[PDB]
Design a protein around this ligand. Sequence first.
Ligand SMILES: CC1CCN(c2ccc(N)cc2Cl)CC1
Length: 282
Amino acid sequence: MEMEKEFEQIDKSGSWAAIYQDIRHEASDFPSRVAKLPKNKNRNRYRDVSPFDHSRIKLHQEDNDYINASLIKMEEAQRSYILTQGPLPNTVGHFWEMVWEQKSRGVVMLNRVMEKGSLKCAQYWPQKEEKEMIFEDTNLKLTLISEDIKSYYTVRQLELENLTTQETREILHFHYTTWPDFGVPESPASFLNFLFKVRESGSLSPEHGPVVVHCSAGIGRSGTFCLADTCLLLMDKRKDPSSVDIKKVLLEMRKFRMGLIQTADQLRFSYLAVIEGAKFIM
Ligand SMILES: CC1CCN(c2ccc(N)cc2Cl)CC1
């Protein structure tokens, strides 16, 4: 079926939970043996969220190459993403090592450091220009260059230096600051405006490594971001845009990381975002 009328049909029939459970039942199951090794217990934020072996990002380090991060490679859309958990106190150096080694330009953050009175991720970037951060375990230096605070999101320019080679690179940090502590946004308008700002920066383009995107576990809000982006790109590329099937795209992405889209409300919000976004594209 088309999207906007399939949407109204699920609303009127109140069957979002059944649609979402079907997706959970059909989703791929692949091994995640490296994630479950005992030496990696303190590298995982949640015991039930792990990267598959076949798609995990490997750190270029012979001691322990493990990080909780996955490469999502969308063949028809010609778009790749790295989805990862919010960094832990003991994995902030690994996080920036990954950014460096994978040649990413942009980092997309969809959570606040504290939500619901608990820490959802480490303070992994510097908050003042004159107070830079040094990660001694991976030999990197990170400096805040500029910060632009808007009503729904903040953009930061960061400088990452490989201290071993003295090479430097500019990284763009896109921070969506207004996702509610519970549920999903009432309108997709600010999320779509945010998605277009990331696009306009060049961070998603093939001339760079894959964008790094995260929330707390790296599957819910993060899944919503890449699902909406890929579906809108396919609607632009194809002769028949009504042939884009959001459920089929989500199952394809779940071949590369488990659990993408965590609730039936997030599924409904993803439909809403693609529907409204398709009108603005033209
Ligand atoms: C990193 C912290 C930074 C402050 N954030 C924040 C919260 C609410 C609004 N409106 C704006 C922002 Cl910038 C929460 C997480």
